[PDB]
Each structure stands twice: as structure tokens, then as C-alpha cells.
Design a protein around this nucleic acid. Structure first.
Ligand SMILES: [Zn+2]
Lengths: 62, 82, 24, 133, 213, 98
RNA sequence: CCGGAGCGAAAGCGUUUGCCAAGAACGUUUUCAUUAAUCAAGAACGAAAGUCGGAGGUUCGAAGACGAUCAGAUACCGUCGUAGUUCCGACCGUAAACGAUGCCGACCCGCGAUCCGGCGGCGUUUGACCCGCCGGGCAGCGUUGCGGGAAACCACGAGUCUCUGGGCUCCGGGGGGAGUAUGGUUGCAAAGCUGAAACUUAAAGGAAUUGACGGAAGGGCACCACCAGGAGUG
């Protein structure tokens, strides 16, 4: 059990996935910058946007 | 090396090449006058002694057999002859 | 395969000796 | 175990991070006394993901709770793959179980890798033509 | 039904005076219930502890096995049982384009402690060496391996168990071998990778109290 | 036709070498013909080195490494994209890729 | 550690130490003085598997059983598992036993490394290392090979063959039938060596080129493809 953490995308790494539907990006927290995790994103995302990841624990293995 | 003089080679090449592959074969060995530091008698010793050479009627050892040239004992001066 | 054709000939001439040794 | 200032009561965590399963085994310094042992298969019901990093993460969070109830504060990590005659690379549950322990409010110290390696192995399973598929 | 950790009472393992950090850690065991007691269950535990956790500032790639020999009032005393290097240290020294010279002896100390020391040494590449491979001929390896066995025998047979451990916390036996074999072939990473305690003499309380005293 | 001058292996002046077994298929492959790959990687990947550093009980503790000697047969090394096919003239380059 | 490194006639050979005999190369202003090279019928050795008699039997695993997978699956995968796998004595003498390249000798390009012996040179480090030379050995690159060959490729020659001749042994004669039948011979057996014919056939095959194709790799492009969706259609 972990709290719903907010994260702001700092730089998009490009489109990923099988059919190219996901967008692997690296996020950056706003409250505490002592954690950096890469997360896949499914949908059109600009630069500097904010996503709401739930797990915030597991990686995506690039 | 298209026109090389095979009859009159420089002495640096004859000295460098193998003793059998020379124009006229000649041994790379010689004889030396090993002088024991204690005694005074001169004994002719082959370069590659191949045998433990000692002074006749003494105790000091002159040479030691090795793979190539003999290893003379310390202080045993020598000179080659021709 | 050529190694199995050799295996069949070995098993073919092996039973030929059986039907030939039994008639003597 | 009353310690002044609440010092770290060190334990030894044996992580058998092989394939098809992942053992998160926490013992004392001698290893003879088992504090808590939970595997990746104990947290999932499908046999295909017993070695999944998610299954090993849940086991690391469960074993970290049992250590706090008994007084263990720090853990000495001893990662171990299948080893021996078989493969010697840790499974996918190695990084997940180890990271989940550090994120579960536990202390990590003296990381090591004790994998059984032979000075001369026996004959491995599978013929000389290998597991072909 | 009942929780098994209700009967677990903690003991404090201690190290002999050969180390600086004497307080080693804690160990748990069930209380004395039934015919079995809690003392004999603690007299067989081995503790593989790194050297940096026993000395103030030393290397961390050298481990020490400490077996418990007696329990004296809630803290059980330990004794030297065996030395071993870290797998990371052993795999990092074994490189390519060089030779490794291993040697093992079976020497008993002044007291009846039969030890089996394992030495390992690698040839060192010269500073101005242009040739890639730094190999030693078989006869040079034999003289180096013979020198390892000659020094390890002299440094152990003429000392007691305490002095050998004091010669193992710093790898003095590894340094003199590297210096002795300098005339044969310059060695690089001479270490004593492992020390097995094959036979142990009759346990007496006076010898154990002399160590921890 | 002869595809390689070294017959796909490294054996000059010998008759038999000790056959080793592959890693992901356990096939008996000669020691010189096997495609070796020494991988030296940390026990903790870069995605978790920060979490271990925060949970470390020491002040300056360098994380260890995991030395793995991998022996791949020609069938599995190509399938795992460890080695690939090259041009007829680009096969002679023995220098490893940087 | 372990290498396109070493040794051995090959097969083959990798923990320490001791013992026994043997060997190449190098060194020699030692000795014998043609004793040599290659060699039918003979003979030693000879991977793995297999056979016979004992000891042993951890792993692996023919056969076999079972669980999957599939149209079927006595296969591939998985779980158990016999003979074997190890050692001793005695047989079999077979491999993609390969460098698919017999052995001895002569001439024939260059360059940089490597292992062993020897020789010389200037320092560094307590023999090691550095720079050359000689002999032998495992190899490599440049040869766009002075040459060869149907190419591929070959300087461990596959070079010095129409400008055809250093010595000698084995061995090939279109593809199948066929390493079969029979005979001889060897073996406990399995089989080895020797080994045809009737008949059948116009090709089989070698190297390379272009194209097509791949449940081969890399790099790219369209909704007559897809992801996310909108309309449907059936
Ligand atoms: Zn493989």
C-alpha cells in the first residue's frame, strides 16, 4: 500500500510498445526530488505535463 | 634485392647469418686463455666448454657447462686467441 | 539421410544371414 | 533485544533468486535460526509468474514486516542464483526483492553474492545436443 | 498454535581480543524446555563476519568464521574457525593474459590446531613491459609455489593460534611471499584466500578465557 | 565451399579440446569454438542503487559486482542477438565492437 | 586462469607433489663415415559407441514408463528411469579419425607478433622487463599474390606442369545397382578387411552470378495494414 503520488514529466524518451501506442518517459516529482522513475504513458503527452502514477515502485525495464 | 652481390658480401651479413648458411661455413666458437686469480698457469679452454673445467693440480673451478657458452667463475680473466 | 540407409542395409544383410544360416 | 539508541540488529537475508521462483529468506547472523521465509509463489496463484519481480516484491514486503516485529533492523544481503551445474545468473526477482527491502524501511549492509560454483561440474541435464526447441 | 518466537531469548556473540570490535551481534534460541537446553544449541553456530566489522579500519573483502565455544551468562563467546575472501575479490583478481600460482599446506600450530592455508598469487606486468602476456615458465611456477609452502609453514608452525590470526588480519604472510618471490617472477596479488581448521584440540576453558580476556 | 579459414573455431596444432556446455541450452560445444561473453555487472542495477544507498548502514560502501562467465553455442549466440551475420569481406574483422 | 598458446606419430593431453623411462629444438672446432629417402605381403598404436569377466554405480541417460503438445506425436518439451557413463583385464580397429590437402628434399615475397634454445646490446626492477640477431615450431596480415587454379581461394603452397621429368608409397576413371551378392579371411558377437555382376540412367556433381523465397538479421515506408476510435457490415 502506497499513496497516490504525482509526477511531472521532465523529458520524453520516445514512443514505445508493440504497436507504438505507449510513450516511455522519465518523470520528476514536485514535492521531493529524491526519486526518479521511468514510466510508460499511453496517450498524447506534451513536454512538462503531469501524470498520476499509482504504484511508483516497479520500473519499466526501458 | 634484385641484383645482390653474392660473391662479396659485407662482413656484417656473414657474421649475422647462421654458421652453416654462410658462403664458407666457419664456427662461431673460439679458444680462450682462462687465468685463475690464485695460480698463474694459463689453460686453453673452449668457448662452449660443455664440461666442468678445473686447473690441473688445483681446486678452483674455471668454467661451468651451460646451454651455450661456458660461464666462467668470478675473477677468472680470459682472452681469445686466433 | 545417408546414415539411416546404411543402418537399414546393416539390418537387411543381418537377417539375410539368419535365413541363410538356418538352411544349413 | 534492548539496545541503546536503537542500534541495528543485523540479520542475514538469503535471496535464492532463481528462475520459476524466488526465495526471500531472512535468518540470524549464524543462519541456523530462521526469522522469516516467504517465496514468490506464496503471493501468487499462477505458476507462470512465481519468479515475477512483482511476486518477489510482495514477499520482500511481507518478510520485512516480520523482522520489525522481532527486532531486526538491518539485513546482510547474500544473493544466490541457481548455481552448481545449472545456470548461475540470478532470476528477475533479485533486483525487485532487494529493492523492496530497502524501500520497506529496512537497512542494507555488506551485500555479497554466494552462488554455488563448482571447481569441476558434473554432467548437466539435457543431452549433448542441448535443450533444443 | 503458540508462537515460536515467544521462547526465543537473545544472546550477545562476542569476538576474541584479536579484534577491536568485540561486540559482534545478537543470536536467538529457544529457552530451556524439555530435556534439551539452550547452551548446547548455541555451541555449534558459525558466524561469517567481514574483517571491516571487527577492526576499526581494515579491508572488507576478508571474512572470518567465528564458532561459538561457550555460553557464559547471556553472552556466548566465539573463537576463530576459518578465514575466507569475498567472491568479488577472488573473481576480480583472476584476469586473463597472466598465470595464477595456487598453493595449499597442512600445518599445525604450536597448539594442536591443524590448519589448511590456501595461497594464491598472480604474476605482475612490468611498467615498461610491451608484451601483452606475462606468463611464468613451469619451473618458475614451481619455485614460486614452493616458496609459498615454505613461508606459510614457517609462519604457522612456529606460532600459536592467536599469533596466526594476528598475522591474518593484516596479510603479512601474503606480503612476504610477494617480496620473497620477487627474484623469481614479480607477483601481483599474493593473498591467503582461505584457511580451513581441519582438527581442533580438546576444548579447555582456560584457553578460551585467555582469548576473550 | 570452405566458409572460414579457421573452420569457425580457434584450434591450430591440436587434435581435441575439452568440450564445454552452453548456458541457455546446455549443448556440448568445444572450448575454442564457443562464443564467450564475460559480463561484469553490479549486483544492484542502476534502478535500485539509490534506494540501497539510502538504506546503507555505512558512509562510503562501494557496491560489489557480479562476474558471470557465459559460454554460448553458435545456435544460441545468434538467436540471442549476441553475434550476427556479416558480409563476406566483413567477416574477417576480429576486433570486438567498441 | 585457458590464449587462433604448448606437447604428442596420430587418437589424444589442464589440481599439488614424488618416482620411472622417453622426446623435440637449441649449443658443439665431440664421434661413426653413407650407415640414407620412400616403402607390397607384415606389425604397434588407435575418440566415441559396442562385446566379455570382476569392482563400482554421484550426476547424466539409449531402451522403457508417464505427463504434456498435436489432426495423430511411439518426436521435439517436462517428470522418473535400464543398459551404459568411471576403474581393472582381455577383444572390436571404426569417425566430418579433416588442414576433407601423404612422406622426404631444393628453389621461391614482404612485414609485425608468438613459444623454445642460443648470441649480443642501454637502462629500469629483485631472474623480471626493454632493443636486435640465429635455428626450430603453432599461426596471422599485406600480397589485389612476379605465380597457380573451374572459381571460391592457396606463401602450414593448392607456387617453381605444354617452358609438361628430384625420389617413393597409397589411390581416382559418368551417376546408380553397391560397399550389395558370392567366395576367402578375422571376430564371443556386433562387424572389419577384400569385393563383383546382371540390370538401370543422360546426367549426377563442383564454384560463382542474377533473381525469387525464409517461421534469418539490420534499416525504413501507406488506414487498399495496425494501435486509439468513429460508421458499419456479417
Ligand atoms: Zn546454446
Amino acid at each position: 500500500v502506497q499513496p497516490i503520488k504525482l509526477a511531472r514529466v521532465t523529458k520524453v524518451l520516445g514512443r514505445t510498445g508493440s504497436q507504438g501506442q505507449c510513450t516511455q518517459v522519465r518523470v520528476e516529482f514536485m514535492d521531493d526530488s529524491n526519486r526518479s522513475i521511468i514510466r510508460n504513458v499511453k496517450g498524447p503527452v506534451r513536454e512538462g505535463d503531469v501524470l498520476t502514477l499509482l504504484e511508483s515502485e516497479r520500473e519499466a525495464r526501458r | 634485392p634484385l641484383a645482390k652481390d653474392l660473391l662479396h658480401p659485407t662482413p656484417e651479413e656473414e657474421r649475422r647469418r647462421h654458421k652453416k648458411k654462410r658462403l664458407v661455413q666457419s664456427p662461431n666458437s673460439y679458444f680462450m686463455d682462462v687465468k685463475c686469480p690464485g695460480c698463474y698457469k694459463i689453460t686453453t679452454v673452449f668457448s662452449h666448454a660443455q664440461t666442468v673445467v678445473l686447473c690441473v693440480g688445483c681446486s678452483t673451478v674455471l668454467c661451468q657447462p651451460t646451454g651455450g657458452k661456458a660461464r666462467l667463475t668470478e675473477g677468472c680473466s680470459f682472452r681469445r686467441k686466433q | 539421410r545417408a546414415k539411416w540407409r546404411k543402418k537399414r542395409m546393416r539390418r537387411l544383410k543381418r537377417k539375410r544371414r539368419k535365413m541363410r544360416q538356418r538352411s544349413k | 533485544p534492548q539496545v541503546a539508541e536503537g542500534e541495528n540488529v543485523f540479520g542475514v537475508c538469503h535471496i535464492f533468486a532463481s528462475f520459476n521462483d524466488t526465495f526471500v529468506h531472512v535468518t540470524d547472523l549464524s543462519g541456523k535460526e530462521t526469522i522469516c521465509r516467504v517465496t514468490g509463489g506464496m503471493k501468487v496463484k499462477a505458476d507462470r509468474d512465481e519468479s515475477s519481480p512483482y511476486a518477489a516484491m510482495l514477499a520482500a514486503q511481507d518478510v520485512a514486516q516480520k523482522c520489525k516485529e522481532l527486532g531486526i533492523t538491518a539485513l546482510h544481503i547474500k544473493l544466490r542464483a541457481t548455481g552448481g551445474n545449472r545456470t548461475k545468473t540470478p532470476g528477475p526477482g533479485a533486483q525487485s526483492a532487494l529493492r523492496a527491502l530497502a524501500r520497506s524501511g529496512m537497512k542494507i549492509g555488506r551485500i555479497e553474492d554466494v552462488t554455488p560454483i563448482p571447481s569441476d561440474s558434473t554432467r548437466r541435464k539435457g543431452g549433448r545436443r542441448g535443450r533444443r526447441l | 498454535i503458540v508462537d515460536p518466537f515467544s521462547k526465543k531469548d537473545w544472546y550477545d556473540v562476542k569476538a576474541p581480543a584479536m579484534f577491536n570490535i568485540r561486540n559482534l551481534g545478537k543470536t536467538l534460541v529457544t529457552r530451556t524446555q524439555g530435556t534439551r537446553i539452550a547452551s548446547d544449541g548455541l555451541k555449534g553456530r558459525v558466524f561469517e563476519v567481514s574483517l571491516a566489522d571487527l577492526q576499526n579500519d581494515e579491508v572488507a573483502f576478508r571474512k572470518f568464521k567465528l564458532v561459538t565455544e561457550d555460553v557464559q551468562g547471556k553472552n556466548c563467546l566465539t573463537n576463530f574457525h576459518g578465514m575466507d575472501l569475498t567472491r568479488d575479490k577472488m573473481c576480480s583478481m583472476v584476469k586473463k593474459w597472466q598465470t595464477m600460482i595456487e598453493a595449499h599446506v597442512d600445518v599445525k600450530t604450536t597448539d594442536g590446531y591443524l590448519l589448511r592455508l590456501f595461497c594464491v598469487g598472480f604474476t605482475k606486468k612490468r611498467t615498461n613491459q610491451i608484451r601483452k602476456t606475462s606468463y611464468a615458465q613451469h619451473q618458475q611456477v614451481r619455485q614460486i609455489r614452493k616458496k609459498m609452502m615454505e613461508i606459510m609453514t614457517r609462519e604457522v608452525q612456529t606460532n600459536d593460534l592467536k599469533e596466526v590470526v594476528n598475522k591474518l588480519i593484516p596479510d603479512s604472510v601474503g606480503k612476504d611471499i610477494e617480496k620473497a618471490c620477487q627474484s623469481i617472477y614479480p607477483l601481483h596479488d599474493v593473498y591467503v584466500r582461505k584457511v580451513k581448521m581441519l582438527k581442533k584440540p580438546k576444548f579447555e576453558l582456560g584457553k578460551l578465557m585467555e582469548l576473550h580476556g | 565451399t570452405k566458409k572460414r579459414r579457421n573452420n569457425g573455431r580457434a584450434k591450430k596444432g591440436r587434435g581435441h579440446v575439452q568440450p564445454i556446455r552452453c548456458t541457455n541450452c546446455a549443448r556440448c560445444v568445444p572450448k575454442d569454438k564457443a562464443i564467450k561473453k564475460f559480463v561484469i555487472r553490479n549486483i544492484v542495477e542502476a534502478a535500485a542503487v539509490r534506494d540501497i544507498s539510502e538504506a546503507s548502514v555505512f558512509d562510503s560502501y562501494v557496491l560489489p559486482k557480479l562476474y558471470v562467465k557465459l559460454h554460448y553455442c553458435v545456435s544460441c549466440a545468434i538467436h540471442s542477438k549476441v553475434v550476427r551475420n556479416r558480409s563476406r569481406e566483413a567477416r574477417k574483422d576480429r576486433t570486438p565492437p567498441p
